[PDB]
């Protein structure tokens, strides 16, 4: 199926007494794999299959790198605030990563945000930065003048990131590549007099990606469907639902298996 690896950074200027100034967390798919912040000042594993398969040297090396990245992030956020003439607490964020799709193709992405909004977005295919405004445009011109760094980022997204992901996928395969099929039921109830709500509910499934819809016999999708979020149930599995009201049938697809419930 589709898998992804990504690393986030978050920088907060003038943080409250409890909030750290800098946090970095990595993910494989929906699973945290690594964590670092300005208080621990240590990069640590966040999944046992990460801890068990990477030697201490890995954590020690990336700890040193993160301590450097933390300082840069603080300085970059200060410069951004100055450009915008902003005072008080603001945020700066980075996301880098890649996906390996089932069909074999890959994606890579590298993006920055300021105060939780898109700021700069890297296009690895064109080797250029998209800027949302003139401040980002200022930063863009600096970065685009550095040809080697752009090439390095492209190479990391397309080759290194993908190799890390495959490696991590193998480490956590018993978790990441398992399948737990959904438990699906359809509930019926007259709500407001004259209107019967139909809920198609799924739970107990992994991976979280699931497709759910309602169809009217025979096969036409209709029409004002309400979708429930895919939510973690706490035991590593997920739950979700879709509802309509009024021959209907709920259709569920999960991990290559299709399910139909006639109402």
């Amino acid at each position, epitope marked *: 199926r589709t898998h992804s690896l990504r690393y986030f950074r978050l920088g907060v200027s003038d943080p409250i007494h409890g909030v750290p100034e800098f946090i970095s967390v990595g993910y494989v798919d929906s699973h945290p794999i690594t964590t670092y912040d300005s208080v621990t000042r240590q990069k640590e594993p966040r999944a046992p299959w990460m801890a068990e398969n990477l030697a201490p040297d*890995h954590w*020690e*090396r*990336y700890t*040193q*790198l993160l*301590r*450097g990245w*933390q*300082q*840069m992030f603080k300085v970059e956020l200060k410069r951004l605030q100055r450009h915008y003439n902003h005072s008080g607490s603001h945020t700066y964020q980075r996301m880098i990563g890649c996906e390996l799709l089932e069909d074999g193709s890959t994606t890579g992405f590298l993006q920055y945000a300021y105060d939780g909004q898109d700021f700069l977005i890297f296009n690895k295919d064109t080797l250029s930065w998209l800027a949302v405004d003139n401040v980002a445009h200022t930063i863009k011109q600096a970065w685009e003048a*550095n040809q*080697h*760094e752009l*090439l*390095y980022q*492209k*190479n*990391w997204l397309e*080759e*290194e990131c993908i*190799a*890390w992901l495959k490696r991590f996928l193998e480490y956590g395969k018993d978790t990441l590549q398992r399948t737990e099929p959904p438990l699906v039921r359809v509930n019926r109830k007259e709500t407001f007099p004259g209107v019967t709500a139909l809920f198609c509910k799924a739970h107990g499934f992994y991976p979280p990606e699931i497709y759910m819809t309602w169809m009217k016999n025979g096969e036409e999708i209709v029409q004002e469907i309400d979708y429930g979020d895919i939510l973690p149930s706490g035991d590593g599995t997920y739950q979700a639902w879709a509802s309509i009201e009024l021959l209907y049938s709920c259709h569920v697809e999960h991990s290559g298996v299709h399910m139909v419930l006639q109402v």
Partner: antibody
Amino acid sequence: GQNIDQPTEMTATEGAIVQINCTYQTSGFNGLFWYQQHAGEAPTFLSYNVLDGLEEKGRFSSFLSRSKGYSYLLLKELQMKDSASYLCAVMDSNYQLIWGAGTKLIIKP
Amino acid sequence: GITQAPTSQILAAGRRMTLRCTQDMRHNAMYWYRQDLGLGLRLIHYSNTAGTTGKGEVPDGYSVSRANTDDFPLTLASAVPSQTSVYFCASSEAGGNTGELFFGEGSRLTVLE
């Protein structure tokens, strides 16, 4: 483990061309640097490659093939002053440099 | 840009030695290498930014500190003859990216019994 190899020494004739090879066996790859170091002097940056191809700077060109795992530094129209050691260095998966032992280039007048 | 001192020193075995290295280019990353005949540069210690340092390939017998961006001193607490070498300090605007290294001169140290 990890390994970066370049010939100990090369000799070519003044006015001619020499190609200095550097092959690398590393877990991952984040680019390859060439440095020049004259005898009794400090090394100085010449080049960086990370994608496939040839990049030209004056009489010096640096080539990279990622699939074949090697780079070369190409010097054209050799001059006596090109006598120096040339250091190859590869950035591995954890962004650390691994240095080759250097190639001493000798030039016959 | 970046400077090392002393650039030459003879030292009796057992004595304490500190090699100084300063750069004024506001580089965050600094490195100490030793260069020996027949070998590639070997990293002793490094520092990606002020307030941290990390061990290189051959850290034993050496120590560093990085209180400040500008300076990266290399200390031999009790020098031994095998620490006879040429020491190079280098800096880079940032550690781990495509920005090149800038080397000091650097320092020929001879340790004799």
